Design a protein around this ligand. Structure first.
Ligand SMILES: Nc1ncnc2c1ncn2[C@@H]1O[C@H](COP(=O)(O)OP(=O)(O)O)[C@@H](O)[C@H]1O
Lengths: 133, 99
């Protein structure tokens, strides 16, 4: 279902500092969240809502395609049932990732905040206009 | 939820207000408790399937940028409208392709 995201635990999963277990260790991991339903955010401090990014998918994958609508296409469940276990696909994907990382390093000098995207930080601020009861 | 809409909401002729938006989930909670089972619900997301339901054509907008209803009546209890085959002996034979 939809879930509520507690403002707690956010700082220590977003911060680059050491976090304890109580064993302490430095944590470095790119974090991603996706759901079919919406989240609940109740905060307005600039400390939060600034290390957050939001996007919304527009396309829809379904068996019976609807013509004249670019936001829908026929789905290929095979992409899920198989195409993961193939070594060749994983090799190609790994090559794509390393190429993209090298491109980022040579362009923006390893800085993700320097990169430019108009839709991002525009949809995100619109989401920030929500979640304020 | 579709059954609840059919039971508690029928097309009102006229002289009916928008009932705001929380009335639908408020009535649906008690209807679900008294019909299927008792359990809590979160009203925020329950609104979306209302647009996903048949009430899409009748979910009007409001000057306060809220969702209101039209052509609706809050019914209750007993209120009226108020206007292939079989093979010879071997099914394990699998038959031809249609089977
Ligand atoms: N580009 C594509 N072309 C064809 N089929 C796709 C494509 N992308 C995804 N699909 C198929 O559409 C389905 C999407 O379902 P899923 O990934 O479970 O969506 P969600 O995670 O939102 O439920 C997948 O099973 C996948 O096989």
């Amino acid at each position: 279902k939809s879930e509520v995201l507690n403002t707690s635990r956010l700082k220590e999963m977003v911060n680059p500092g050491d976090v304890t277990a109580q064993e302490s260790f430095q944590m470095t991991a790119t974090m991603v969240a996706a759901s079919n339903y919406n989240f609940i955010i109740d905060t307005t401090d600039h400390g939060t809502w600034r290390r957050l990014r939001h996007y919304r998918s527009k396309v829809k994958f379904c068996h019976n395609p609807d013509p004249s609508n670019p936001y829908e296409k026929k789905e290929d469940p095979r992409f899920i049932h198989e195409y993961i276990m193939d070594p060749d696909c994983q090799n190609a994907f790994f090559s794509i990732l390393v190429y993209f990382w090298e491109k980022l390093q040579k362009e923006y000098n390893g800085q993700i905040k320097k990169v430019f995207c108009p839709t991002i930080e525009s949809e995100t601020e619109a989401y920030r206009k929500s979640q304020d009861t | 939820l579709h059954r609840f809409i059919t039971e508690r909401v029928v097309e009102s002729p006229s002289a009916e207000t928008v009932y705001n938006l929380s009335e639908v989930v408020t009535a649906y909670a008690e209807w679900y408790n008294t019909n299927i089972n008792v359990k809590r619900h979160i009203a925020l997301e329950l609104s979306q399937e209302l647009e996903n339901s048949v009430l899409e054509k009748y979910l009007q907008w409001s000057p306060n940028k809220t969702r209101i209803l039209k052509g609706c009546r809050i019914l209750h209890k007993f209120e009226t409208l108020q206007p292939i085959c079989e093979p010879k002996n071997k099914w394990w034979e699998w038959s031809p392709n249609p089977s």
